[PDB]
Design a protein around this nucleic acid. Structure first.
Ligand SMILES: [K+]
Ligand SMILES: [K+]
Ligand SMILES: [K+]
Ligand SMILES: [K+]
Ligand SMILES: [K+]
Ligand SMILES: [K+]
Ligand SMILES: [K+]
Ligand SMILES: [Mg+2]
Ligand SMILES: [Mg+2]
Ligand SMILES: [Mg+2]
Ligand SMILES: [Mg+2]
Ligand SMILES: [Mg+2]
Ligand SMILES: [Mg+2]
Ligand SMILES: [Mg+2]
Ligand SMILES: [Mg+2]
Ligand SMILES: [Mg+2]
Ligand SMILES: [Mg+2]
Ligand SMILES: [Mg+2]
Ligand SMILES: [Mg+2]
Ligand SMILES: [Mg+2]
Ligand SMILES: [Mg+2]
Ligand SMILES: [Mg+2]
Ligand SMILES: [Mg+2]
Ligand SMILES: [Mg+2]
Ligand SMILES: [Mg+2]
Ligand SMILES: [Mg+2]
Ligand SMILES: [Mg+2]
Ligand SMILES: [Mg+2]
Ligand SMILES: [Mg+2]
Ligand SMILES: [Mg+2]
Ligand SMILES: [Mg+2]
Ligand SMILES: [Mg+2]
Ligand SMILES: [Mg+2]
Ligand SMILES: [Mg+2]
Ligand SMILES: [Mg+2]
Ligand SMILES: [Mg+2]
Ligand SMILES: [Mg+2]
Ligand SMILES: [Mg+2]
Ligand SMILES: [Mg+2]
Ligand SMILES: [Mg+2]
Ligand SMILES: [Mg+2]
Ligand SMILES: [Mg+2]
Ligand SMILES: [Mg+2]
Ligand SMILES: [Mg+2]
Ligand SMILES: [Mg+2]
Ligand SMILES: [Mg+2]
Ligand SMILES: [Mg+2]
Ligand SMILES: [Mg+2]
Ligand SMILES: [Mg+2]
Ligand SMILES: [Mg+2]
Ligand SMILES: [Mg+2]
Ligand SMILES: [Mg+2]
Ligand SMILES: [Mg+2]
Ligand SMILES: [Mg+2]
Ligand SMILES: [Mg+2]
Ligand SMILES: [Mg+2]
Ligand SMILES: [Mg+2]
Ligand SMILES: [Mg+2]
Ligand SMILES: [Mg+2]
Ligand SMILES: [Mg+2]
Ligand SMILES: [Mg+2]
Ligand SMILES: [Mg+2]
Ligand SMILES: [Mg+2]
Ligand SMILES: [Mg+2]
Ligand SMILES: [Mg+2]
Ligand SMILES: [Mg+2]
Ligand SMILES: [Mg+2]
Ligand SMILES: [Mg+2]
Ligand SMILES: [Mg+2]
Ligand SMILES: [Mg+2]
Ligand SMILES: [Mg+2]
Ligand SMILES: [Mg+2]
Ligand SMILES: [Mg+2]
Ligand SMILES: [Mg+2]
Ligand SMILES: [Mg+2]
Ligand SMILES: [Mg+2]
Ligand SMILES: [Mg+2]
Ligand SMILES: [Zn+2]
Lengths: 150, 138, 208, 235
RNA sequence: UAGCGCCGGCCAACUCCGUGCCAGCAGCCGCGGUAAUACGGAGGGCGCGAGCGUUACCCGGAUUCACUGGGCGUAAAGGGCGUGUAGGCGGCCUGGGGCGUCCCAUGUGAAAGACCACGGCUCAACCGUGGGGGAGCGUGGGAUACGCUCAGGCUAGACG
RNA sequence: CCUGGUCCACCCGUGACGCUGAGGCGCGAAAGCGUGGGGAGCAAACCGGAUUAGAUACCCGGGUAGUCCACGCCCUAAACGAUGCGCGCUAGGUCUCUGGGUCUCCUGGGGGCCGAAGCUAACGCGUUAAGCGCGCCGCCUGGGGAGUACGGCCGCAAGGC
């Protein structure tokens, strides 16, 4: 019912009297490939707990994507921190052309053909957040004419 | 003085909507009024009207916003998500009819100043004339 | 090159049972029916989570080794498909299926694709009457792929077409067993092929 | 429901400073350096707010009353001790809504200790525990007095001062819970979903608004109750 | 006839022995001082295949000279300050011109190449035939919103 | 005494006369140079006393250029808000300097603090923007080599660009 894929898993370290102590963080995307996505970043002393916590947080933070024949309705451009994401719709038969993070996020959203570009900072966390905000700032023609009813 | 009165009006609209103002007054001119006609026609604003401040004529632009949203940040969605001047003084942008951009693949507009008046991207394309790319709005 | 050598080791490495010998990949002797792990000393060991490049490369290698086409012709066909208008993957599959050796295999004249390649290269196959000995020959819709009149007395063709009695052919092919010929009706659709390959993975592999 | 002219002492707001510009729409004028609430817009918003309250009450919903300003504690502790809407009185604990499960575990411990003091198990495990658990139950009843009635998340919250109770407001926003609040000039009206532009310092304003609100609540479920015994709390 | 490179990460492919900061490897991070998936050999594997590697050079990634498409408080970066020349830029209204701008028509844009289709060498490479193009510039005609120019007017900028 | 800038009130006059500004030109702390003068205190160099393993230092006693003045040079800096100038737009609160006014307060200019929206890598900025815009100039393109070499221009020299 819900597909789950991890973006990256890292081990951070805090200093304490005696040495360094490690804590694992993990990004996880969840999607039904029908138009709903979810991104989560979980931290835990061990890797499996971090993955499970990231899955929970991802399922808690969902985004409804307005797919239009497997692609996006309009080109977007989002700056999250120093990381820029550029999305652009593509005709079918093109495929998803993106970095690892945006490819995973868009594939779990149900996108089949899209053109992307990462600019500025290539940080996977910030790129993921920028892609999520990009999918969140998507508007359909129905939404546009709904905002201009008056 | 104002170096670019049109960009000044666009920035007034932007700064007004960003704080969810009721209306904003811009120093009046026929060019700005002809642009505001396109704005109110396309539904980005509730409308405009000529007004008078202490001695001088202005234009009150009445802004438009979406419904109040739920959860944190209940501020409504902006009707004018983006409004940017293109053909600025010092770098003027003129495009042919085959060079008129399609803003947001249709969901936006591009205001042009052509020999047949101030039109939109689709309006000028239907008329078959190009001109100065004033600004992009979506 | 043609990779000539062991074949069922690809049945094992690719993780999906391939049919490179024709028979003996259906019989309990494929070594995939009894040894599903990859070849080598480190085949039975616990496999690590492969990278995305690993997945795409393995899928492309599966699709390529199914037809036995070298990397040169394979990449050329993919670029040709990407140049054309339409979905790249389905057009690529239609191009691969349009090869003369693969058509000979699909028409039941040969039990395997490499046996079909040898049958073509030795002039035992004709196209519209004229003898053709090129496996890379592209068959157009309407071409009549026949067997050489001088080769219809050979034992292997007798066997293969004697076993083809009653067997159905692909929806895009017709077969006349008595006359030992067939027709390429149309380009096959994606639904017509049951290949265990995700074409989008190969498109993404060449997108890099 | 007849509070048209009886609004005696509600229009008084805070001083010229310590205000919020977003409240300017609900302000009539400034008399002697004190913001006075617009009397018309007060009832204008009261119509919609009390209508939402009636709709939510006749449907059987639960409303959480939050008051800590030390001028509405004794009022909220009984206006909610009327029709079974819960309340938070002494202080608003961080996570009462977003971490509702842990606070419900605390409530489980509260009723557990109530069951221990109801069973003859008080004498065993001698006086040390008989004092520790006594003080524990004391503070649990002190903090979870009205909160113990919430079996699930509430359908709405009622606030006396959304600036003093800003944490509860934020938690309600996070969970998409409607926010009813008696706002004053020192609060941001955008965060409040159903605003009641009155006074939060005076006792008569709070008593009037909350009494009429609980009366509307019981009127929506039938069985009109007698006037609330909160007048004696004028002192 | 089957060979060549690789198997620490980037990057697809792991074990044994030898060696002991030695001998060496290395595009970048880096590996070796006793048990090295990184050196050397072996077995096995991965990748291509009459080729496989290396070096050199060009574009790419590189939004890293940022027109599209970057920056300058603390990361490289605001001139020590002013006066002011050239230059760049120019508030509101009306009119004339039509230089910029835009539109139509037409000429030009050799062939080959590129794109598309069909066809010829058994296919392909290669080649033939046909089709479609296209900025720019010339000419004739037209448009005047904006920029420009000229003439006049206004007082919100500026000065008194 | 001579003299520059600036702010406010009146709404009086001119009628876009505006903004910026490559070059050019002028000003430019301290130190330093030239000529002349002055020289109390201070004080590079220097003469000593201590300290120290040594003490070309810190500490102590002296002390010249200099610091000062006139005139002429020199063009540097953590010349700092490490933030070019101008105009417009975008919540407020508080402290303060300076006007005007119906002088609880309002309004205008200036100096601070806290903070809306927003921005920022963060610290922080936030009507005195580092926000939103427009115009023009200056400058940056990894670190060392190196603000060095060469050439030029300037300077008496030190040396500067
Ligand atoms: K941003
Ligand atoms: K023969
Ligand atoms: K050796
Ligand atoms: K080795
Ligand atoms: K002397
Ligand atoms: K500097
Ligand atoms: K005064
Ligand atoms: Mg949506
Ligand atoms: Mg940035
Ligand atoms: Mg970068
Ligand atoms: Mg990098
Ligand atoms: Mg042109
Ligand atoms: Mg349509
Ligand atoms: Mg294609
Ligand atoms: Mg294509
Ligand atoms: Mg690997
Ligand atoms: Mg090597
Ligand atoms: Mg190299
Ligand atoms: Mg050894
Ligand atoms: Mg060893
Ligand atoms: Mg090894
Ligand atoms: Mg080997
Ligand atoms: Mg080569
Ligand atoms: Mg390169
Ligand atoms: Mg480039
Ligand atoms: Mg690029
Ligand atoms: Mg470079
Ligand atoms: Mg640029
Ligand atoms: Mg940069
Ligand atoms: Mg400066
Ligand atoms: Mg000039
Ligand atoms: Mg000039
Ligand atoms: Mg003008
Ligand atoms: Mg001019
Ligand atoms: Mg005219
Ligand atoms: Mg012309
Ligand atoms: Mg040509
Ligand atoms: Mg090309
Ligand atoms: Mg042919
Ligand atoms: Mg043409
Ligand atoms: Mg002409
Ligand atoms: Mg005309
Ligand atoms: Mg004039
Ligand atoms: Mg004046
Ligand atoms: Mg006047
Ligand atoms: Mg006059
Ligand atoms: Mg100036
Ligand atoms: Mg200058
Ligand atoms: Mg000086
Ligand atoms: Mg001096
Ligand atoms: Mg001297
Ligand atoms: Mg002297
Ligand atoms: Mg002395
Ligand atoms: Mg000494
Ligand atoms: Mg010592
Ligand atoms: Mg001694
Ligand atoms: Mg001394
Ligand atoms: Mg002396
Ligand atoms: Mg001297
Ligand atoms: Mg300073
Ligand atoms: Mg400075
Ligand atoms: Mg710096
Ligand atoms: Mg400044
Ligand atoms: Mg001020
Ligand atoms: Mg601050
Ligand atoms: Mg903020
Ligand atoms: Mg902060
Ligand atoms: Mg500013
Ligand atoms: Mg350097
Ligand atoms: Mg260098
Ligand atoms: Mg240096
Ligand atoms: Mg120097
Ligand atoms: Mg020199
Ligand atoms: Mg000289
Ligand atoms: Mg010297
Ligand atoms: Mg020296
Ligand atoms: Mg020097
Ligand atoms: Zn097999």
């Amino acid at each position: 019912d819900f597909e789950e894929k991890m973006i990256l898993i890292r081990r951070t370290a805090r200093m304490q009297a005696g040495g360094r102590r490690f804590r694992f963080g993990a990004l996880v995307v969840v999607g039904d490939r029908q138009g709903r996505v979810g991104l989560g970043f979980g931290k835990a002393p061990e890797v499996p707990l971090a993955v499970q916590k990231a899955g929970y947080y991802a399922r808690r933070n969902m985004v409804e994507v307005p797919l239009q024949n497997g692609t996006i309705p309009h080109e977007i451009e989002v700056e999250f921190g120093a990381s820029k994401i550029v999305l652009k719709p593509a005709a079918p038969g093109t495929g998803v052309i993106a970095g690892a993070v945006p490819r995973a996020i868009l594939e779990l959203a149900g996108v089949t053909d899209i053109l992307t570009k990462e600019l500025g900072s290539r940080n996977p966390i910030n790129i993921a957040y920028a892609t999520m905000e990009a999918l969140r700032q998507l508007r359909t023609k129905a939404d546009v004419e709904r905002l201009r009813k008056g | 003085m104002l170096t670019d009165p049109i960009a000044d009006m666009l920035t007034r609209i932007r700064n007004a909507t960003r704080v969810y103002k009721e209306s904003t007054d811009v120093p009046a001119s026929r060019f700005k009024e002809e642009i505001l006609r396109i704005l109110a026609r396309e539904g980005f604003i509730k409308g405009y009207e000529r007004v008078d401040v202490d001695g001088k004529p202005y234009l009150r632009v009445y802004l438009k916003y979406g419904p109040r949203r739920q959860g944190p940040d209940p501020r409504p969605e902006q009707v004018i998500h983006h409004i940017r001047r293109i053909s600025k003084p010092g770098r003027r942008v003129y495009v042919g009819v085959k060079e008129i951009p399609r803003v947001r693949r249709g969901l936006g507009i591009a205001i042009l100043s052509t020999s047949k008046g101030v039109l939109t991207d689709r309006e000028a394309r239907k008329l078959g004339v190009g001109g100065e790319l004033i600004c992009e709005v979506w | 090159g043609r990779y000539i050598g062991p074949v069922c080791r690809l049945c094992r490495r690719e993780g999906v049972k391939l049919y490179l010998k024709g028979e003996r990949c259906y019989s309990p002797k494929c070594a995939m029916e009894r040894r599903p792990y990859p070849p080598g000393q480190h085949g039975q060991k616990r496999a690590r989570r492969p990278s995305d490049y690993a997945v795409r490369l393995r899928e492309k290698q599966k699709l390529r080794r199914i037809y036995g086409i070298s990397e040169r012709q394979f990449r050329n066909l993919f670029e040709e498909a990407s140049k054309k208008k339409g979905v790249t993957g389905s057009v690529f599959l239609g191009l691969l299926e349009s090869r003369l050796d693969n058509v000979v295999y699909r028409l039941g004249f040969a039990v395997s694709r490499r046996q079909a390649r040898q049958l073509v290269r030795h002039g035992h196959i004709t196209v519209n009457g004229r003898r053709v000995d090129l496996p890379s020959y592209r068959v157009r819709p309407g071409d009549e792929i026949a067997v050489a009149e001088k080769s219809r007395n050979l034992e292997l063709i007798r066997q293969n077409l004697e076993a083809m009695k009653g067997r159905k052919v692909g929806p895009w092919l017709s077969l006349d067993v008595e006359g030992m010929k067939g027709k390429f009706l149309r380009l096959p659709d994606r639904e017509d092929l049951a290949l265990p390959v995700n074409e989008q993975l190969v498109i993404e592999f060449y997108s890099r | 429901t007849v509070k048209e002219l009886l609004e005696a002492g509600v229009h008084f707001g805070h001083e010229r400073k310590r205000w919020n510009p977003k409240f300017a729409r609900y302000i009539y004028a400034e008399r002697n350096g004190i913001h006075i609430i617009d009397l018309q817009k007060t009832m204008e918003e009261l119509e919609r707010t009390f209508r939402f309250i009636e709709d939510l009450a006749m449907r059987g919903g639960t409303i959480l009353f939050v008051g800590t300003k030390k001028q509405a504690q004794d009022i909220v502790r009984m206006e909610a001790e009327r029709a079974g809407m819960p309340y938070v009185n002494q202080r608003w604990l961080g996570g009462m809504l977003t971490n509702f499960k842990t606070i419900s575990q605390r409530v489980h411990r509260l009723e557990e200790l109530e069951a221990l003091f109801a069973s003859p198990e008080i004498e065993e495990r001698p006086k040390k525990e008989q004092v520790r658990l006594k003080h524990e139950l004391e503070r649990l009843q002190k903090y979870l007095s009205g909160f113990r009635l919430l079996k699930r998340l509430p359908d709405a919250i009622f606030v006396v001062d959304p600036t003093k109770e800003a944490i509860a407001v934020r938690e309600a926003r996070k969970l998409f819970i409607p926010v009813i609040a008696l706002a004053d000039t020192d609060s941001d009206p955008d965060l409040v979903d159903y605003i009641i532009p009155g006074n939060d310092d005076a006792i008569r304003s709070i008593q009037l608004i909350l009494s009429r609100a609980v009366d509307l609540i019981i009127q929506a479920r039938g069985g009109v109750v007698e006037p609330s015994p909160s007048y004696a709390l004028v002192q």
